[PDB]
């Protein structure tokens, strides 16, 4: 289905360096949108490089190969 409100209500607030800075519910659901599509695009990029190697399984090595671009534009 997707990321939940209780999930991103704690995950994003873990790393915040100030205790008084929060994320609103309408913005929290957009964090849901972008973190869901984060897995979605990471998965489709991995599937696409697997298709470039014409493979049925995606492994750790191709993910490490795309990281220099995965963290780069996405």
């Amino acid at each position: 289905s997707g990321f939940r409100k209780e999930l991103v209500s704690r995950l994003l607030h873990l790393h915040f360096k100030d205790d008084k800075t929060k994320v609103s519910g309408d913005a929290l659901q957009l964090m849901v949108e972008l973190l869901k599509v984060f897995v979605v695009e990471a998965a489709v990029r991995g599937v696409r490089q697997a298709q470039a190697e014409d493979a049925l399984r995606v492994d750790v090595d191709q993910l490490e190969k795309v990281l220099p671009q995965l963290l780069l534009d996405f």
Partner: protein, 97 residues
């Protein structure tokens, strides 16, 4: 002690939900996400959400503000034109809610 007790529960939550999303995408493209694959993709999502947290606070700081507005996450979608056009209509959907 707080580091372990925190990051354990956060990556456990995100990996639970991305396991749900892996069963969700595995039926879209009829592929199978291996255990090492889901573990790697969840940890990549986590280490990138690290930069997301580094990002959004300074994005508010840039416009002299503390809270996170929809423009702060709009510049999050600015990173690529594809997810620009995506998160635009998803933000219109959020406004629909």
């Amino acid at each position: 002690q707080q580091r372990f007790s925190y990051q354990q529960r956060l990556k456990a939550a995100v990996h639970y939900t991305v396991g749900c999303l892996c069963e969700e995408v595995a039926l879209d493209k009829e592929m199978q996400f291996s255990k090492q694959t889901i573990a790697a993709i969840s940890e990549l999502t986590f280490r990138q959400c690290e930069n997301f947290a580094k990002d959004l606070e300074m994005f508010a700081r840039h416009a002299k503000r503390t809270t996170i507005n929809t423009e702060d996450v709009k510049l999050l979608a600015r990173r690529s034109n594809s997810l620009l056009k995506y998160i635009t209509d998803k933000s219109e959907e959020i406004a629909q809610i």
